Amino acid sequence: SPGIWQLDCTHLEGKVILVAVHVASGYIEAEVIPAETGQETAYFLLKLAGRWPVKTVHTDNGSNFTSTTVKAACWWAGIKQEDGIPYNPQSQGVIESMNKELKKIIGQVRDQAEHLKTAVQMAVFIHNHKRKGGYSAGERIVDIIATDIQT
Amino acid sequence: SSPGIWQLDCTHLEGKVILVAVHVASGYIEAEVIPAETGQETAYFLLKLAGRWPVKTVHTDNGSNFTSTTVKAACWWAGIKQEDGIPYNPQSQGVIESMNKELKKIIGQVRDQAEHLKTAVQMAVFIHNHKRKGYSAGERIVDIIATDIQ
Ligand SMILES: O=C1Cc2ccccc2/C1=C\c1ccc2c(c1C(=O)O)OCO2
Ligand SMILES: O=C1Cc2ccccc2/C1=C\c1ccc2c(c1C(=O)O)OCO2
Ligand SMILES: O=C1Cc2ccccc2/C1=C\c1ccc2c(c1C(=O)O)OCO2
Ligand SMILES: O=C1Cc2ccccc2/C1=C\c1ccc2c(c1C(=O)O)OCO2
């Protein structure tokens, strides 16, 4: 469970925002891409798994589930690729809520940056630092993974 | 003071620039390929970093990025103390130089498995961070920051 991530893809300004959520903590990484292809998704997972211990990924849709490039990246990085089917239905709502939160932050900083990608990274910054402890998502992920290392 | 300190490091390969941030206390890195090191690239890269780890201090890699107003804007935004990168401890220039070689060596060993340099560079970041030294850099940074919170 310290190793489970969920991929999430949302839209804004006719661009695509790919998001990985660390399910246990709510911590995210996100990027702007021109379209969600297998190649983007695979490259994004390679980045994530080099930066956090990614054991399992719940892919956002069936195309990325099926994608050969995605499977190659998952194999390369040691990731157990899974579907992202909400066998707990509160899953669709939690994600939908995140997407709305993120878009609201992106809107609040909209003005401080010329490009959408800068706004998105500002929104990642704010989401990850936001106090619940009240511990933030960033503190939780570190706490979860550190606990896990000492066992 | 050590859990928040990062060092910027810029190196070259295949006519492109590899921008690296090293968590000084753990050796853990993030890195990107850019067409050229500009203030804007450096500022955007720092914004990314500080959204993903608690970045308190950055030692910039050179005086241009030290001076750059875009880099100062991103440091301000993200709450980062921008410092110089003067190796007051000389054991620094040597540690950074070794890393760059280690990275290029890893990039060379994977270079065949990916069409693009960016992919090879992220493979290298993956290999460096996971390498057992037997704790890894990725293990160390989590333990350093966890200890700090608690
Ligand atoms: O003006 C500000 C304040 C600020 C605070 C934090 C980060 C960036 C910026 C910033 C501009 C900017 C800078 C670099 C970029 C970039 C943009 C942008 O305007 O989108 O796009 C890609 O690299
Ligand atoms: O530990 C981590 C991992 C991480 C990853 C990304 C962002 C923050 C953090 C983080 C901690 C943290 C969190 C929120 C904060 C904050 C701190 C902090 O510096 O302790 O101070 C302001 O709001
Ligand atoms: O073939 C493989 C094996 C592999 C293992 C891990 C990650 C990528 C790849 C990969 C290809 C690839 C995929 C996406 C990319 C990308 C490349 C590339 O070939 O550089 O460049 C940008 O997005
Ligand atoms: O805890 C962290 C943070 C982190 C950030 C980035 C990469 C790895 C890790 C990491 C741990 C880890 C490290 C090396 C390994 C390894 C593990 C692991 O999965 O625990 O298993 C194989 O070599």
Residue numbers in the entry:
A (entry chain A): 57 to 188, 192 to 210
B (entry chain B): 56 to 188, 193 to 209
The authors write:
One of these analogues, lactone 1, was identified as a new hit. One of the hits that demonstrated good density in the LEDGF site was lactone 1, which was found by SPR to have better affinity (750 µM vs 1570 µM) for the core4H than the core3H construct of the CCD. Core4H has a Trp131Asp mutation not present in core3H, and this residue forms part of the wall of the LEDGF pocket, suggesting that this compound would not interact as well with wild type IN. However, the electron density found in both sites did not closely match structure 1, but instead closely matched the acid form 2, which is an isomer of lactone form 1. Compound 1 was from the CSIRO library and was not tested in the AS, but the ring opened form was synthesized and tested and showed the same structure and binding mode in the crystal structure. In addition, the carboxylic acid of the compound makes a virtually identical interaction to Asp366 of the LEDGF loop. This charge interaction is key to the series developed here, to the series of peptides that have been shown to interact with the LEDGF binding site on HIV IN, and key for the binding of other small molecules that have been developed by other groups.
IN is a critical enzyme in the HIV life cycle as it is required for the integration of viral DNA into the host chromatin, and therefore persistence of infection. One component of this complex is lens epithelium derived growth factor (LEDGF/p75), which has a conserved IN binding domain (IBD, residues 347–429) that mediates binding. Within the IBD is a loop (residues 362 to 369) that binds a pocket formed by a dimer of the HIV IN CCD. We herein present a novel, small molecule inhibitor of HIV IN that binds to the LEDGF site, discovered through fragment based screening and structure based drug design, which has low micromolar activity in both biochemical and cellular infectivity assays.
